[PDB]
């Protein structure tokens, strides 16, 4: 019955717990703790290269990010196993955040870079390794393009981490290419 494995589950719990903390303590106090290192003295607090992905300030984005995390991460954990999901997450979180802060500074967050990685990965891995048993549905490709496009053209009304999203997608494509040389 259950569709979400342990990694899928624990990521959702963490995102929720952090979302609550941001209501109780305020956005900024949590950002100070969880943001990408915003000072050289913070560059060895290694959690911060990944924890930015757990922060949301917007009810709509956390909902949608967790929706696609639940669905795509769940598919990947079930078919390809927990370890694979962990690696895509850490690598996409790391590199998406790297590209984002490079061009716009450290004040950012959201699980969306990991979601785009997962979209990229499930798509390409399905396209050219059909026997893997993972596949990105056409309806989902459409839904993800509109969402991306809405972000690029600022239709949501908020500030958008376009670097992290595009970098995240690229990572998920690259990993799927490699993973399916076969």
């Amino acid at each position: 019955r259950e569709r979400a494995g342990p990694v899928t589950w624990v990521m959702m719990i963490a995102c929720v717990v952090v979302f609550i903390a941001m209501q109780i303590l305020g956005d900024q106090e949590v950002m100070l703790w969880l943001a990408w290192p915003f000072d050289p003295t913070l560059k060895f607090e290694f959690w911060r290269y990944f924890t930015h992905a757990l922060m949301h300030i917007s009810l709509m984005h956390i909902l949608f990010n967790l929706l696609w995390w639940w669905y795509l991460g769940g598919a990947v954990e079930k078919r390809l196993g927990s370890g694979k999901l962990i690696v895509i997450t850490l690598i996409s979180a790391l590199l998406s955040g790297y590209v984002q802060q490079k061009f716009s500074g450290p004040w950012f967050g959201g699980l969306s870079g990991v979601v785009y990685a997962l979209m990229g990965y499930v798509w390409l891995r399905g396209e050219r390794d059909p026997q893997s048993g993972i596949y990105l549905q056409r309806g989902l490709i459409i839904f993800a393009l509109i969402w991306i496009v809405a972000g690029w053209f600022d239709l949501f009304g908020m500030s958008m981490a376009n670097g992290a999203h595009i970098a995240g997608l690229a990572v998920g494509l690259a990993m799927a290419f490699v993973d399916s040389l076969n």
Binding site: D27, M31, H52, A53, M55, H56, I57, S58, H61, S96, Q100, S104, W107, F108, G109, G110, L111, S112, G113, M158, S159, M160, A161, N162, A164, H165, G168
Partner: peptide, 4 residues
């Protein structure tokens, strides 16, 4: 926050 830029949201991702």
């Amino acid at each position: 926050f830029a949201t991702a």
